[PDB]
Structure 1
Amino acid sequence: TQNINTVDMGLGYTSNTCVAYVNRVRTDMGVRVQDLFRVFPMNVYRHDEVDRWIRHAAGVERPQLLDTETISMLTFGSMSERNAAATVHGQKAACELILTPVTMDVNYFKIPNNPRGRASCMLAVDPYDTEAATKAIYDHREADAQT
């Protein structure tokens, strides 16, 4: 073992980085949707026959109990999605879907924007001001700061 200590000798940032080159994309850049039956595995429809019909219409499987607190303390994960038989493209970039009024304008999607519909970048807010932060992101009687 060799012990290493480092002291930064500038009064500002003395080093800076850049992302110079992109070699490849590891994910598939696909349109395969996230499997909410794997994320929330316990939920069933109250009427069992409706639940089984909904299971069959999608490709989803029967519900599963979560780990006990003891077992989740002794084990560090489950990973209920097994690997597929072949992987031609890279990693699955599972799309998460948020539901949208059909009348939301397309000019919003054309520039970078918060996909939830309101700005939330805290670099616009006074630091350590929690009431201003809550007001900025959730209060709907004052204007969104972006549009």
Structure 2
Amino acid sequence: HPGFALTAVRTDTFEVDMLLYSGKSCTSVIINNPIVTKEERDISTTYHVTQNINTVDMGLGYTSNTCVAYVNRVRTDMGVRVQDLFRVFPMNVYRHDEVDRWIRHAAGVERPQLLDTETISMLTFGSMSERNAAATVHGQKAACELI
């Protein structure tokens, strides 16, 4: 036991079917005539049709309600994989290089292998660095963050 406890926080995503009720003539919608715009190339011509609609709310209060009626699946795995801070804070290193290498090897995190344009972009601007697993069987990885 390292001498301190920790609480994990995880978010899971469910796929649901919704139900809504709306009162009669609760909102007024005014529609205008369509407008057609032409865009001509050499081989073909593309036409764009745009319709303008205006909505105004006529309720003195809430005239519509919503219910989450039914659920059938979990998108996420509801797992216990912890969030990799080395991915979210990639620029940070220990000031002594040998101990930095030792820590990175012990944690199972791989140093960026060579100085490259994609590595520079990942360090400076950020990118989807994690890459997908070879096979996905439980859905998305709901990463647990620790306090």
Q: Calculate the TM-score normalised by the size of structure 2.
A: 0.57
- Give the total of aligned pairs: 90
> In the TM superposition, what are the counterparts of 1:57-72 in structure 2 within 5 Å?
57-62=106-111, 65=120, 66-67=123-124, 72=125
1:90 aligns with one of 139, 142, 145: 139
Q: CA–CA distance in 1 between the matches of 2:52 and 2:65?
A: 26
1:6 aligns with one of 44, 51, 55: 55
Whichever structure has more strand as a proportion of its residues is 2
C-alpha displacement of 1:88 = 0.4
C-alpha displacement of 1:46 = 1.3
C-alpha displacement of 1:58 = 1.4
Whichever structure has more helix as a proportion of its residues is 1
Identical pairs, percent: 96
C-alpha displacement of 1:60 = 1.0
Residue range with higher mean Cα deviation, 58-67 or 21-30? 58-67
How large is the RMSD of aligned CA atoms in angstroms?
1.5
Q: Give per-residue Cα distances to partners, 1:1-44, cap 9 Å, x unaligned.
A: 11121111101000010111111110000000000000000111
Q: CA–CA distance in 2 between the matches of 1:53 and 1:19?
A: 50
Q: Calculate the TM-score normalised by the size of structure 1.
A: 0.57
Q: CA–CA distance in 2 between the matches of 1:96 and 1:48?
A: 27
Gaps of 5+ in 1: 99-147
> In the TM superposition, what are the counterparts of 1:95-106 in structure 2 within 5 Å?
95-98=144-147
Q: Which residue number corresponds to residue 81 of structure 1?
A: 130
> Quick check: which has more Rg, 1 or 2?
2
1:31 aligns with one of 69, 80, 94: 80
